[PDB]
Amino acid sequence: TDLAIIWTNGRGDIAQDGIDMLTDDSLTTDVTISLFTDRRALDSDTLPDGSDDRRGWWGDSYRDRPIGSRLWLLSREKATPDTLERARGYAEEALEWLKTAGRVSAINVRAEQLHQGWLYLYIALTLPDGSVIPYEFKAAFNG
Amino acid sequence: ASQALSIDPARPLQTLTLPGRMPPAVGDRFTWSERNALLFDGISTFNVNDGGEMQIERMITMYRTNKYGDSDPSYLNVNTIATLSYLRYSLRTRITQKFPNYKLASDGTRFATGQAVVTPSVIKTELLALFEEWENAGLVEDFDTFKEELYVARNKDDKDRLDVLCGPNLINQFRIFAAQVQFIL
Amino acid sequence: DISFNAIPSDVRVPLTYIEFDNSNAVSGTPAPRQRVLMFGQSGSKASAAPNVPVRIRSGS
Amino acid sequence: GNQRQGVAFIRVNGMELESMEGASFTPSGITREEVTGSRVYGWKGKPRAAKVECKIPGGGPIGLDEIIDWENITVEFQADTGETWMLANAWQADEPKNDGGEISLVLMAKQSKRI
Amino acid sequence: GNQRQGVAFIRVNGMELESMEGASFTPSGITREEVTGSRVYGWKGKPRAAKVECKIPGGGPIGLDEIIDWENITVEFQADTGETWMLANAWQADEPKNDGGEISLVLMAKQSKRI
Amino acid sequence: GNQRQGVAFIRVNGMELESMEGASFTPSGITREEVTGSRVYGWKGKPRAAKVECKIPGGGPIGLDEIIDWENITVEFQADTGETWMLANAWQADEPKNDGGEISLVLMAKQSKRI
Amino acid sequence: EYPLRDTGGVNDLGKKLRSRTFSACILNSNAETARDEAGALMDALDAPGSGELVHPDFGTVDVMVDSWECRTKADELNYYAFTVTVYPSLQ
Amino acid sequence: TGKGTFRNVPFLVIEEQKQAGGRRLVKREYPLRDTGGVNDLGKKLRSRTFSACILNSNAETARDEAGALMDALDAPGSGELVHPDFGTVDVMVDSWECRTKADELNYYAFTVTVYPSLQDTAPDAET
């Protein structure tokens, strides 16, 4: 039972609940961390910035697996189906590690362009008959 | 900005690092709410990366009101300006390349084949082919509405002057990244 | 899906919304829809107007 | 009681060709083929390219030397009652032969739009 | 002395096409083939799909742009003396080419059923 | 209102042949073919050689003995309204047969130029 | 076969395994549901242990996969064809 | 659009694609016994393969693209293969071909087979 990643104003910080920080033991924290943390870009990949560094984590060489997802490669894109297909592929490759273990059964992800200027991803994971009902929330804005 | 907009005009500038630049101290950087409120006032904003290098958060022109007085978001993005400039250049150079010096005649008249004559129905097809090339490139969105809105005619007051009304639909950039995770319990 | 009103009109920064759910509707499309109605009493401190349908998505 | 069809006009780069009768036009889309096992299961798509075929009289102002080197033109297959189909970037096809007094032209393109 | 046959009408989604003469309609069923060894043995079945073929004069109200995009329609091959056959959920087939002034339509379906 | 086409004359080494009607002339260039994968990709070139085919009535001043042995000649396919195409160094082709009263001649060449 | 003599010996030792093989195909007009079905069948073909196979010619049986292919001809947009050979599980 | 890439070198897909792989079986047949069977042994690698074509209208850009594709297929390491059918997979190339015909001036045909770049130790040390 670790802390929970609460999404406020487009970024996720830990929050309090009564005495201590609110806890969560479910797949919600596992997914929201495996999806929205930048992992190291490959040697051949091109970067959205004009710079030359590749993100990641210094503990990547310590935790036996690359940490997060390569969705930061789509920081700046135009509305074309190429970006939708790439986002679908990146989400699949980021979330495959769950299906490699037994914590999920199947993953189905689709990409779409909603109201102009919206990249919409629908990810459906099939939890087994031995999974704790996961956490549910909606991102909120204040101030 | 010039390098990015010359490589591809319809590409946002959401994350472009400024090389060899020193950001302000952490006590002077604008907060999220301050940047959000400042973006409405026609001033672009910056963000600070995980490293020390700073990047541009959004490039926005100082245009915030229409001619009549109300708010108008048409000329907000610099991408609209860049794409419009490129489209104007493409139109100019295609017309110059195709029809440098041709005689002008009415739509129904027919002359000897292999002659240098342009009719109002020829440049219409030329513009439609140019729009299809634009759509292949990736700068214009909808072709059916462009076809149904395009209008080309003679001046009817000056003998050699052709009036056109294109009205293209520009492509859109991704500002929001909406995600929805569903657990099939 | 996600309503266009979700993102407030006061923001022009790239935002990257995120949502989570728990239902079994996989397609997300409006198939022939089922709307089960439920009559029942509510104890004190209910804070709900009597005799008006209310849409509920969670036990909490 | 409008006119249905007749002689069809071909126009490349804005010049008429005065093609003889027999012009044909295949639009670009998806080809459907049946797939059969114990029963008929459905269709199986296959892409195709648009094509316009005609024959022109010989000795005209447009000759074979100009015809052969055609790789970027804007073709317009137009009928009498409108119904114009534009080929954006078309190119000549397999073989032109000046048999008798008619030159057989075939111009193919990647996409065909209706104007 | 009833009228036997003549022009046969085609109706797709409840609208007529004015198909010219020469319409053909192969029904769906089982195809029989003969199996021969030392002596003739019997028949060996084989499934097939319903198909209706016709030609549409060009320049009409229904054009090639609308004709191409047909993958869920109900077809009604109706003869002069009644005897209508409904094609269940038809789709357009191999290739429409507009030669002369005629569009060669062919619609295949999984089930032809007499009404 | 110029004359378009009619009897087309063939001249080898500066001498006419009196070819019967039906002469054909395929020019030299590049043959285009379509390459289709998931969509249409473009064209794939292929070289071809110029060729002039005709028929000569038999029993004339020029016979099969002289016609067979032709491996270095200059051919001039000239239409009625000018437009002459020259084959620099042509050679006779597959097979001459004198059926009825017509000798079928065909001359190939590496390059054809419009004079 | 015994040398320098006409006669030869033939003896039976048991029965060989049944090497049943089949070909299948899955196509859907959505062109994306076809990919989903192909992926699901790939995942169900590559899995540990022996799973039941329902077939018109063979019927319900327990077997183990030995090999399969997904031959799509690129030009075909909805077609995926598998060819599988299976052997009975040892009990 | 059929725009598969190997190392950000683009190529066009054609001909047939293929993924093959299954479990390794050991056949157990006993002498003078009828009932037999097989026994499971792991699962063999998924050997993917595809056929690609490089063509243009210039006959020199085609040569340059073909050379880039050859020098990117013949490179040390594992590259991010992108395929409209396979997806995005890091694979290690096993062989390839570069077929032309001396008659087609723009066409260059490639046939590649790749293997997954998974590297796991045998002993699998623990604590």
mmCIF file of C-alpha atoms in Angstrom, chain G residues 2-75:
data_model
loop_
_atom_site.group_PDB
_atom_site.id
_atom_site.type_symbol
_atom_site.label_atom_id
_atom_site.label_comp_id
_atom_site.label_asym_id
_atom_site.label_seq_id
_atom_site.Cartn_x
_atom_site.Cartn_y
_atom_site.Cartn_z
ATOM 1 C CA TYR G 2 16.844 -61.589 -45.732
ATOM 2 C CA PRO G 3 19.810 -61.704 -48.144
ATOM 3 C CA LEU G 4 20.130 -64.543 -50.664
ATOM 4 C CA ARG G 5 16.504 -65.545 -50.025
ATOM 5 C CA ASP G 6 13.185 -64.434 -51.479
ATOM 6 C CA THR G 7 11.165 -64.167 -48.262
ATOM 7 C CA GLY G 8 11.192 -61.218 -45.888
ATOM 8 C CA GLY G 9 9.863 -60.421 -42.435
ATOM 9 C CA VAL G 10 7.373 -57.692 -41.539
ATOM 10 C CA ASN G 11 6.464 -56.920 -37.927
ATOM 11 C CA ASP G 12 4.171 -54.381 -36.274
ATOM 12 C CA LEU G 13 5.152 -52.218 -33.284
ATOM 13 C CA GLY G 14 2.259 -50.058 -32.189
ATOM 14 C CA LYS G 15 0.620 -47.185 -34.035
ATOM 15 C CA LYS G 16 1.993 -43.850 -35.203
ATOM 16 C CA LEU G 17 0.684 -40.531 -33.925
ATOM 17 C CA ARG G 18 -2.022 -38.727 -35.900
ATOM 18 C CA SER G 19 -0.383 -35.653 -37.445
ATOM 19 C CA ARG G 20 -3.580 -33.721 -38.099
ATOM 20 C CA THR G 21 -3.102 -30.333 -39.759
ATOM 21 C CA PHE G 22 -5.516 -27.712 -41.064
ATOM 22 C CA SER G 23 -5.687 -24.233 -42.566
ATOM 23 C CA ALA G 24 -7.910 -21.398 -41.352
ATOM 24 C CA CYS G 25 -8.566 -17.758 -42.188
ATOM 25 C CA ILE G 26 -10.140 -14.791 -40.403
ATOM 26 C CA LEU G 27 -11.381 -11.684 -42.210
ATOM 27 C CA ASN G 28 -13.570 -8.793 -41.089
ATOM 28 C CA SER G 29 -14.701 -5.726 -43.012
ATOM 29 C CA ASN G 30 -13.625 -3.321 -40.246
ATOM 30 C CA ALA G 31 -9.930 -3.872 -41.167
ATOM 31 C CA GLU G 32 -9.116 -3.347 -37.461
ATOM 32 C CA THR G 33 -11.315 -6.013 -35.917
ATOM 33 C CA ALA G 34 -9.514 -8.357 -38.315
ATOM 34 C CA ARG G 35 -6.189 -7.372 -36.740
ATOM 35 C CA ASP G 36 -7.677 -7.810 -33.262
ATOM 36 C CA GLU G 37 -8.908 -11.310 -34.138
ATOM 37 C CA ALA G 38 -5.540 -12.199 -35.682
ATOM 38 C CA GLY G 39 -3.698 -11.077 -32.554
ATOM 39 C CA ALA G 40 -6.095 -12.988 -30.313
ATOM 40 C CA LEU G 41 -5.628 -16.164 -32.353
ATOM 41 C CA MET G 42 -1.844 -15.704 -32.291
ATOM 42 C CA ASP G 43 -1.903 -15.385 -28.499
ATOM 43 C CA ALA G 44 -4.170 -18.435 -28.222
ATOM 44 C CA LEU G 45 -1.897 -20.445 -30.537
ATOM 45 C CA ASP G 46 1.279 -19.578 -28.586
ATOM 46 C CA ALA G 47 0.384 -20.675 -25.051
ATOM 47 C CA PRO G 48 1.692 -23.327 -22.639
ATOM 48 C CA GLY G 49 0.017 -26.697 -22.353
ATOM 49 C CA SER G 50 -2.623 -28.391 -24.471
ATOM 50 C CA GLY G 51 -5.961 -26.788 -25.300
ATOM 51 C CA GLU G 52 -9.065 -28.182 -26.946
ATOM 52 C CA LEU G 53 -9.620 -27.771 -30.689
ATOM 53 C CA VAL G 54 -13.091 -27.650 -32.239
ATOM 54 C CA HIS G 55 -13.119 -28.433 -35.953
ATOM 55 C CA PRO G 56 -15.804 -29.546 -38.422
ATOM 56 C CA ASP G 57 -13.738 -32.377 -39.907
ATOM 57 C CA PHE G 58 -11.968 -33.505 -36.717
ATOM 58 C CA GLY G 59 -14.306 -32.515 -33.878
ATOM 59 C CA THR G 60 -13.541 -31.732 -30.265
ATOM 60 C CA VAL G 61 -10.050 -32.954 -29.360
ATOM 61 C CA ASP G 62 -7.079 -32.042 -27.150
ATOM 62 C CA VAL G 63 -3.866 -31.276 -29.051
ATOM 63 C CA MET G 64 -0.643 -29.260 -28.928
ATOM 64 C CA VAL G 65 0.410 -26.650 -31.482
ATOM 65 C CA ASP G 66 3.561 -27.274 -33.507
ATOM 66 C CA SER G 67 3.669 -24.345 -35.986
ATOM 67 C CA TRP G 68 1.552 -21.624 -37.706
ATOM 68 C CA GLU G 69 1.883 -18.627 -40.103
ATOM 69 C CA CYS G 70 0.087 -15.292 -40.792
ATOM 70 C CA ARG G 71 0.493 -14.971 -44.592
ATOM 71 C CA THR G 72 -1.014 -11.547 -45.492
ATOM 72 C CA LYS G 73 -0.360 -10.554 -49.154
ATOM 73 C CA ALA G 74 -0.177 -6.780 -48.365
ATOM 74 C CA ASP G 75 -2.622 -6.122 -51.280
#
